[PDB]
Amino acid sequence: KVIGLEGGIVCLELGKDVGLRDDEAEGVIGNFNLQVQMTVTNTNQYVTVTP
Amino acid sequence: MSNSAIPLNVVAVQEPRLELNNERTWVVVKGGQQVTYYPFPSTSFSSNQFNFICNPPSAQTVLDRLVFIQVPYDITFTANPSHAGITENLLQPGRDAFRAFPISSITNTLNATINGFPVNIELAQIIHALSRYHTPLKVKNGWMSMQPSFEDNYQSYRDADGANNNPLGVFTSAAGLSELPRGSYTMNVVTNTTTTARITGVLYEQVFLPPFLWDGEQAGGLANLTSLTFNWVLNNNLARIWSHSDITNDVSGNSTIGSMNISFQQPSMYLGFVTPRLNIPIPPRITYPYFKLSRYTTQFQNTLAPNASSTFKSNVVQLDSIPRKLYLFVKQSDNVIYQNLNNQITTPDVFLQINNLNLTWNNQQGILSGASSQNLYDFSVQNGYNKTWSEFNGVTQQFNGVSGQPTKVIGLEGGIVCLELGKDVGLRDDEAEGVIGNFNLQVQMTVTNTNQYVTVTPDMYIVAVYDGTLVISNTSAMASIGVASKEEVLNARITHGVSYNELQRIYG
């Protein structure tokens, strides 16, 4: 028996693993955009997860 | 040099094979870093609408001018009884295609709002006559190639079979390095038997209307907008996308196809945004050229054919300001070909052959009135027409070698005159190519139906493009029309730097 255990929840600090063009830091305003295209797998055996 | 009459000035030029000196300056080409493309899938798609509301990423990033959309689609055909039967596949090797350009003529109107003040155009009737007008072979094998792109050149589809330039054939049978026919275009055929066909794929149609550009040649895209958004609406019928041939429909009928239906999925636009680099700053507000084209249209009651002639005039209109140039043609009418759909799928686009055209600018009456139909085809081709003489004035004899079968005459599809409005219409002293206003127009033009079968009620169309400034400064979009003053048009000193040919280069 294969058991689903849970999922990752990644978090990337904005200066740390994103990198920001010079003159940018966690305070500074403003107006930028973000969109996350991300592939995933349902692990749970029993039910269909509508995501 | 100073030998003749009034003496001239000497200059010498080196032949190409040798300068060998001149001043050779190394030129570093630079453009901002980060050019990226997004696919904005339309929010609120429907069966009679598409709406793509997308926002510029930073509002400090210039937006490139070419834009296009892609729609996945699905059609089911089915055979009517009678005509029946019937024993051939409902889709035929040489007698079947998309109309060009498909997802265009099908759409009733398109309006994109920038920044946002709306700029919208009429895509159903405008475009089919706008296509002929500015594209060289260089272009019709470039950007224009993403959608079916081969225009109807036979007065009747039935005749075409089987030519080497039948406007809707297989890819094999278009001679090397030329524009293919519209049965070239790729798409899955899930089924195809007698009584049923069913096809699927995806078509890329680029948007027209300024300032988005369908020429290949490019110019600085619109920054610094804060939000833009397109909005189609398609007219009801939707049977206009497909095309057909009479050659298979034969009978007391009637035909093989009637009827069939379409289905769309998630369409999406495709925008592109460069970023300029932090060294070179672009101005806070900035001015763009901007064109608007809007068609005026009469309808008549008189029915003329199969090759008989007559004469027509069109209700006066009052232009606010001189269009920079206007087009005029008589096409087969709308009131027909929107009934009993077999007509919709089997009538080509083509216009009737012109005999002569006299028109009136403000108060003049009878302009051009004595210019031979031949002499109308001289301009354009000087404003960029692009079809051989025999195509304009469409008629073509082609005879049969036996005793005794009379020679067969085909309509070769008619012509469409475009007269650039200062270039060869002439305007009173101190009147520019676009100043307010306001001057009547009235087009009196005799025509002949050259299509062998059958009769046709016609309509007249006259599409006038105006030339306005448009200043997009965030976040306002003022758009003054008639930019030059009547006093400024007198004594605006001529220049010898600019070439007029370079201005007719910038479409348009």
Swiss-Prot record, chain B:
Disulfide links within the chain: none
Lineage start: Viruses, Varidnaviria, Bamfordvirae, Preplasmiviricota, Maveriviricetes
The UniProt record lists the keyword DNA-binding: no
Superkingdom field: Viruses
GO cellular component: viral capsid
Major localization listed first in the record, in broad terms: virion
Subcellular locations according to the entry: Virion
InterPro entries referenced in this protein's UniProt entry, alphabetically: MCP_V20_C, Sputnik_MCP_N
Function, as annotated: May self assemble to form an icosahedral capsid. Most abundant protein in the virion.
Protein name: Putative capsid protein V20
Cell inner membrane recorded as keyword: no
Keywords: Capsid protein, Virion
